[PDB]
Amino acid sequence: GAMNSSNYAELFNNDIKLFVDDTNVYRVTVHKTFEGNVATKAINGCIFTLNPKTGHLFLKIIHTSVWAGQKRLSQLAKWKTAEEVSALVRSLPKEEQPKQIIVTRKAMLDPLEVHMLDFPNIAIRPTELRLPFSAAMSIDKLSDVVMKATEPQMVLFNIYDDWLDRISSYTAFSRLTLLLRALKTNEESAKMILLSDPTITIKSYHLWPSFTDEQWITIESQMRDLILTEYGRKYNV
């Protein structure tokens, strides 16, 4: 059934599972036409498919050409997402295929269920947590590869960099979610925190800066303050 605050710890067990977030698949800018009507222009998007135990991210880039001449794009986007996730599963060796796929939005359930009929033993689950994977395009290297794509492409990342050498997947996921929750609430301030100190760099093969354990504690705390700050600015508390 649904993953929630009671059973979220199943994320860090040894049954392979993937999260699928479709919130950045169909992206548009809305603008005025010369006649003063409104129109959309699509921009490149991505499926965010993540193993929370290992950090492996399967970033499928959605090039704007997939929308050409299609109608009802917001509906199509969910079915395209499910088509690509099914193709990914089929591409993986049997022992790497997931036992469960958790979708972050319930509107993905039927599209993914239908595309996965050939995989009756893979459980398709919703979740009651309102997670922040929409902010994935606030990670500079992920946004850069999406915008630069000129054709459909799959790019593989580890979204935890090398953190699992020092912390557990529970703690690593805790660190990733906190970072994403803050880029989503105040991207400018969040990125200021992450790069304020020019002596801490991002390795070429990494997504986040190379903080020591003690600096991550400081960073974590500054992210805990920002979220709360913005919460007060929003609600006036």
Add this chain to the structure above:
Amino acid sequence: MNTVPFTSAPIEVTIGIDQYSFNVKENQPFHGIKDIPIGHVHVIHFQHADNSSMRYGYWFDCRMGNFYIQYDPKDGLYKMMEERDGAKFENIVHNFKERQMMVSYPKIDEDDTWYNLTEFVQMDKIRKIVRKDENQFSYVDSSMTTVQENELSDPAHSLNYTVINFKSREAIRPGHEMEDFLDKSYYLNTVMLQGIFKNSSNYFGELQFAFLNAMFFGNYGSSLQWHAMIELICSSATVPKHMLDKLDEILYYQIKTLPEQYSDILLNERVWNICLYSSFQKNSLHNTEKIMENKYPELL
């Protein structure tokens, strides 16, 4: 006009014949039902006064044999049986008529209700849904589960309706996932009509039989099957014009006949609102939409 005699009525019971019903008191001198129209299937059904649990009954066609009812005190129910000795049967019936111990099938001449509810229902098809090949008539009751219900337990007492499942490989062509899920025409027209039912008459017959078992016995799996068969048509963008017009008539008479006080349990809100207001056929069921809006506007 045919007759179904009763040996006796040893326990108090409400007896139905098609859409009619009457109460018989314990050991009342009741010996059956006469003047039954030839040309239709019929159903004779029972609810005991002392245990309204288990409505049960028998589907039959008097053209296929001489049938009568006899109470069994061991199994505790009214059983249908076939009499093979034709002169024994005629002599039993004629005697019971001369003593006027029979109720008359009370059909109004203007009235086409039963025809309209059973237009496509055939005994031969009923006997394939309800498997008991040594009898010419078919027993159904409130508790019997369907093949599909058993998949999700005694197979000999099951209703073998055609399984319909919108998220199934049968329903969804590889490579047309979105197309086939959002527009079920290929599942309706190729898989079900051309492949399984062979023609729309047989599809309508099973739909009508499922409705009647839902209404007369409160059979829950039959209600599921009736709604699934409606939904499969309404969710198809491409449906022969003759089937849509006939479906509108079929449903009209079903909604008209439904007890006003059973609507809460025999009508699925989601299916009906989707079918009448959201589906491809939202504008093709004028008679059914009009009676539903005037008779059950709460559900909508």
